[PDB]
Amino acid sequence: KRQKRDRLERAHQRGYQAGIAGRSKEMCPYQTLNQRSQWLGGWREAMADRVVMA
Amino acid sequence: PRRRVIGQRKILPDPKFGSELLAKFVNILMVDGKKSTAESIVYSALETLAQRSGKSELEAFEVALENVRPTVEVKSRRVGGSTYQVPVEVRPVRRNALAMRWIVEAARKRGDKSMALRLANELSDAAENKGTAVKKREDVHRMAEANKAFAHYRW
Amino acid sequence: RKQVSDGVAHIHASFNNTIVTITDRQGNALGWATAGGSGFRGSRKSTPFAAQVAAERCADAVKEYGIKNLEVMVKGPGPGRESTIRALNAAGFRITNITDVTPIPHXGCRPPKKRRV
Amino acid sequence: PVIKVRENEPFDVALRRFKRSCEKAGVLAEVRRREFYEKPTTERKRAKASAVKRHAKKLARENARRTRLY
Amino acid sequence: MQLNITGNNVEITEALREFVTAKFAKLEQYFDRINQVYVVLKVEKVTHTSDATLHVNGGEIHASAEGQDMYAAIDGLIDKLARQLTKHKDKLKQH
RNA sequence: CUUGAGUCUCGUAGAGGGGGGUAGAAUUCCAGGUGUAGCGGUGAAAUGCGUAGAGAUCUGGAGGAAUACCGGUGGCGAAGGCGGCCCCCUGGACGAAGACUGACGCUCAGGUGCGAAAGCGUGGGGAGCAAACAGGAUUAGAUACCCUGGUAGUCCACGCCGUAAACGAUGUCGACUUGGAGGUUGUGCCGGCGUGGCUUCCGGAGCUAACGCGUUAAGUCGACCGCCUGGGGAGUACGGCCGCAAGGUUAAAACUCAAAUGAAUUGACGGGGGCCCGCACAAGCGGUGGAGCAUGUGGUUUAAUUCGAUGCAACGCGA
Ligand SMILES: [Mg+2]
Ligand SMILES: [Mg+2]
Ligand SMILES: [Mg+2]
Ligand SMILES: [Mg+2]
Ligand SMILES: [Mg+2]
Ligand SMILES: [Mg+2]
Ligand SMILES: [Mg+2]
Ligand SMILES: [Mg+2]
Ligand SMILES: [Mg+2]
Ligand SMILES: [Mg+2]
Ligand SMILES: [Mg+2]
Ligand SMILES: [Mg+2]
Ligand SMILES: [Mg+2]
Ligand SMILES: [Mg+2]
Ligand SMILES: [Mg+2]
Ligand SMILES: [Mg+2]
Ligand SMILES: [Mg+2]
Ligand SMILES: [Mg+2]
Ligand SMILES: [Mg+2]
Ligand SMILES: [Mg+2]
Ligand SMILES: [Mg+2]
Ligand SMILES: [Mg+2]
Ligand SMILES: [Mg+2]
Ligand SMILES: [Mg+2]
Ligand SMILES: [Mg+2]
Ligand SMILES: [Mg+2]
Ligand SMILES: [Mg+2]
Ligand SMILES: [Mg+2]
Ligand SMILES: [Mg+2]
Ligand SMILES: [Mg+2]
Ligand SMILES: [Mg+2]
Ligand SMILES: [Mg+2]
Ligand SMILES: [Mg+2]
Description:
Chain D: Keywords: Ribonucleoprotein, Ribosomal protein, RNA-binding, rRNA-binding. Chain C is an alpha/beta fold and about 120 residues long. Chain C is built from 3 helices and 5 strands; from the N terminus they run E-E-E-H-H-E-H-E. By secondary structure, chain E is α+β, with helices and mostly antiparallel strands. Helices cover about 30% and strands about 35% of the residues of chain E. Chain E has helices spanning about 15-25, 70-90; strands spanning about 1-5, 35-45, 45-55, 60-65. Chains A and B meet through loops of A and loops of B. Chain C binds one RNA strand of 319 nucleotides through strand 1, strand 2 and strand 3.
């Protein structure tokens, strides 16, 4: 409540969640290459996990 | 909350045994702002724990605490029409908070005369895997063990 | 009773369940377990964990026989399509060989209609 | 996707070979696809969407380099 | 479903009471867990109006309708709540 | 007369059509062996299948239907449509040089033929799928969606039907008018430079109500045909023709409304999407709902129970 959460971590978990829910890379809302790397990083980790879920 | 809460508080350690741990334990038992009343009730219990185990106080009250801390809890998560109970690690500080809460909760729910008696008995029983307090932990652990399959979701 | 040494482990990973059966190398069944039999039902039945149990509780269904070698032979798209291959390792077999044998028609028959929901 | 295990090869190197074996043979894609019958109109209408997208994935790699942020 | 009637510039007779109660008894078939509900009837110049508010199991549903009579107002109102109640149910029985 | 139209000569590419063979994958069944308690299915379940031995796994046999990969905003056809491999019959297009005919052309009411899927007739066939139908669920109900089965039908031969958002919602033929990036198929001359056909995307002038179209025009013109004339009533009724039937085709009126419509604009809304917040959830602490009493309100009561405040934002409120 007093201070904003880590932007990189949040960006990595937003990436994961679009991942699992099956959106396309290139929905990524970041052009800040730093946050972008976190977003895709999550999105690709999530692509692995979808396989073993139903 | 959505942002991060900044500024953790400062528990002063116990006047007697000079422990932040026991100081927390008082607050948890404390009711309606009556810190002194709680301070009494606590020491008189440890007396009567010490006077039977004969194993110090800040070292006896501990042994109760170890018999009852959980290591894995369950979080609920709505999936389809159903609700998935899912097992998660417990944070060290959390499993302190839970042990101390379950001990207090178990104490009050007894028929003994003083509060001090109830606490004492409960802490003793805790040390020999016995009371409701320790029953509760067992049950928690049973549930997380049951639905282990949902260990690795992130959902 | 008659010891073997060299076996093969078929794994049938459906979306709803995971059957696993050890057989001699002429395909004669020796033991088997499932997620359904392992003690999981519905939501749980269809997980990689429930499939893991199956594999290892099928491993201690074939102690009677010799052991060492085991060529795994996996079929279907279920979640039980590795957690088993893992479990057989720590069960203490040596996996010489491992192959997807998921059947695919080269056209074949008309699949069922698509689910509206 | 038929990997034999090599001399002294760790299990968790065979396994990852085996995974990558059928990733590149695209098995689960094929099975996923044939779970249900798609009308030949639907299949063919999918094929256009793929095309009108791929095409516009030979546009960003050009046009962005022309424009500029901040 | 516990009911309550008001009248802001209207005398609640024992048609308008009996009538309104019967009309509201339907709503329970759209959602079984209705609790207390308050009804209000108005007459301002020429406009007849009827609003109700419905405490339900995890919600609060409200609508108001205007008729040329109060009966026609209440007729209108019951059609409005029906739709809202169904919407509610369906986003709980959501499997 | 040779520029439009056509004929011959040499080649090219192609799921163009018709007939007959055949090969591998898979599903279902039947018969064996192994083996033992569950399988199957769903959001969750149940019906169903299984100790009369299923499911799983291996071997042998039968039978039908469709042809993974190649495969592409690829190719062919008047359109509908056409996809394994191999022979037999057969149509069209395109190019390179030459020769030949000499306006033999374009369009076309009536007419004639082809015409997806469903459907109909006769005789076959029947793996998978699946209207109807039956059972299980869900729900206030659920003649549905979801699950378990499953008959016509889907397949072959011959004959009917003549319809589809049969669509580029864009008739056919010819001429003319800035460009760019591709795909596919010929052929010149030196892996560069030309010259043909078909095709995909983008855009200029112009055009358009706008959206958009843009040398494959919805631009600029010429030739012929088809069709429209406010919305409902109605592509319906009556009549004729066609059909075994289902039905198709041609095609009104009374009555009634002052609108009905197209494209674009600002908002609002979505059981649409993205991103951020909030005692919103989560983590917690103490309560209200039960009792007695205080107090306000509704109701009833009254001679009068003064008047006002009424979802959130009236009900210890004006007082
Ligand atoms: Mg199915
Ligand atoms: Mg009505
Ligand atoms: Mg066979
Ligand atoms: Mg001459
Ligand atoms: Mg004609
Ligand atoms: Mg005709
Ligand atoms: Mg037909
Ligand atoms: Mg019939
Ligand atoms: Mg027939
Ligand atoms: Mg027949
Ligand atoms: Mg079926
Ligand atoms: Mg069905
Ligand atoms: Mg039924
Ligand atoms: Mg034939
Ligand atoms: Mg025929
Ligand atoms: Mg028509
Ligand atoms: Mg038309
Ligand atoms: Mg032209
Ligand atoms: Mg254009
Ligand atoms: Mg034109
Ligand atoms: Mg126009
Ligand atoms: Mg009309
Ligand atoms: Mg007619
Ligand atoms: Mg007629
Ligand atoms: Mg007749
Ligand atoms: Mg409009
Ligand atoms: Mg919104
Ligand atoms: Mg809470
Ligand atoms: Mg509470
Ligand atoms: Mg009460
Ligand atoms: Mg009370
Ligand atoms: Mg009053
Ligand atoms: Mg007044």
